[PDB]
Amino acid sequence: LKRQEAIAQNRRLTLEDLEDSWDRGIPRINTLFQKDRHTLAYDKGWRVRTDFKQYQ
Amino acid sequence: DETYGVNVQFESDEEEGDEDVYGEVREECTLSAN
């Protein structure tokens, strides 16, 4: 809802906005503020890769 | 202006915690059988 209302007012969800829910929930919302965000969007199959890392 | 002569400053700057400076959260045929 915050993202849609920021888009309505032509604004980008701030890390401070994320700070309100600082890494809220099981996952860390903070990641929404990481720099590699764009790069990590192509890192598909990473959980299975990490699980298979034991063989390498 | 010509401005002949410009010094350079090469240092190990831009050190951060892999985040974005902006206050805002860093923006991120088919098969057929016969």
UniProtKB/Swiss-Prot annotation, chain A:
Disulfide bonds: none
Compartment(s): Nucleus; Nucleus speckle
Highest taxon above the source species: Eukaryota
Tissue: Widely expressed.
Chain positions with N6,N6-dimethyllysine modification: K35
Domain description: The MPN (JAB/Mov34) domain mediates interaction with TSSC4 and SNRNP200. Has structural similarity with deubiquitinating enzymes, but lacks the residues that would bind the catalytic metal ion. Contains a region with structural similarity to reverse transcriptase, presenting the classical thumb, fingers and palm architecture, but lacks enzyme activity, since the essential metal-binding residues are not conserved.
Quaternary structure annotation from Swiss-Prot or TrEMBL: Part of the U5 snRNP complex. Component of the U4/U6-U5 tri-snRNP complex composed of the U4, U6 and U5 snRNAs and at least PRPF3, PRPF4, PRPF6, PRPF8, PRPF31, SNRNP200, TXNL4A, SNRNP40, DDX23, CD2BP2, PPIH, SNU13, EFTUD2, SART1 and USP39. Component of the U5.U4atac/U6atac snRNP complexes in U12-dependent spliceosomes. Within the minor spliceosome, which acts on U12-type introns, interacts with PPIL2 and RBM48. Core component of U2-type precatalytic, catalytic and postcatalytic spliceosomal complexes. Found in a mRNA splicing-dependent exon junction complex (EJC) with SRRM1.
Function: Plays a role in pre-mRNA splicing as core component of precatalytic, catalytic and postcatalytic spliceosomal complexes, both of the predominant U2-type spliceosome and the minor U12-type spliceosome. Functions as a scaffold that mediates the ordered assembly of spliceosomal proteins and snRNAs. Required for the assembly of the U4/U6-U5 tri-snRNP complex, a building block of the spliceosome. Functions as a scaffold that positions spliceosomal U2, U5 and U6 snRNAs at splice sites on pre-mRNA substrates, so that splicing can occur. Interacts with both the 5' and the 3' splice site.
Involvement in disorder: Retinitis pigmentosa 13: A retinal dystrophy belonging to the group of pigmentary retinopathies. Retinitis pigmentosa is characterized by retinal pigment deposits visible on fundus examination and primary loss of rod photoreceptor cells followed by secondary loss of cone photoreceptors. Patients typically have night vision blindness and loss of midperipheral visual field. As their condition progresses, they lose their far peripheral visual field and eventually central vision as well.
Record-given protein name: Pre-mRNA-processing-splicing factor 8
UniProtKB/Swiss-Prot annotation, chain B:
Tissue expression pattern: Widely expressed.
Compartment(s): Nucleus
Top-level taxon of origin: Eukaryota
Self-association state and partner proteins as the record states: Component of a core complex containing at least PRPF8, SNRNP200, EFTUD2 and SNRNP40. Component of the U5 snRNP and U4/U6-U5 tri-snRNP complexes, building blocks of the spliceosome. Component of the U4/U6-U5 tri-snRNP complex composed of the U4, U6 and U5 snRNAs and at least PRPF3, PRPF4, PRPF6, PRPF8, PRPF31, SNRNP200, TXNL4A, SNRNP40, DDX23, CD2BP2, PPIH, SNU13, EFTUD2, SART1 and USP39. Component of precatalytic, catalytic and postcatalytic spliceosomal complexes. Component of the minor spliceosome, which splices U12-type introns.
UniProt note: domains: Contains two helicase domains. The N-terminal helicase domain has catalytic activity by itself, contrary to the C-terminal helicase domain that may have a regulatory role and enhance the activity of the first helicase domain.
Its job: Catalyzes the ATP-dependent unwinding of U4/U6 RNA duplices, an essential step in the assembly of a catalytically active spliceosome. Plays a role in pre-mRNA splicing as a core component of precatalytic, catalytic and postcatalytic spliceosomal complexes. As a component of the minor spliceosome, involved in the splicing of U12-type introns in pre-mRNAs. Involved in spliceosome assembly, activation and disassembly. Mediates changes in the dynamic network of RNA-RNA interactions in the spliceosome.
Family listed: Belongs to the helicase family. SKI2 subfamily.
Disease field: Retinitis pigmentosa 33: A retinal dystrophy belonging to the group of pigmentary retinopathies. Retinitis pigmentosa is characterized by retinal pigment deposits visible on fundus examination and primary loss of rod photoreceptor cells followed by secondary loss of cone photoreceptors. Patients typically have night vision blindness and loss of midperipheral visual field. As their condition progresses, they lose their far peripheral visual field and eventually central vision as well.
Protein name: U5 small nuclear ribonucleoprotein 200 kDa helicase
Gene assigned in the entry: SNRNP200
Parent-protein residues present: 196 to 243 of 2136
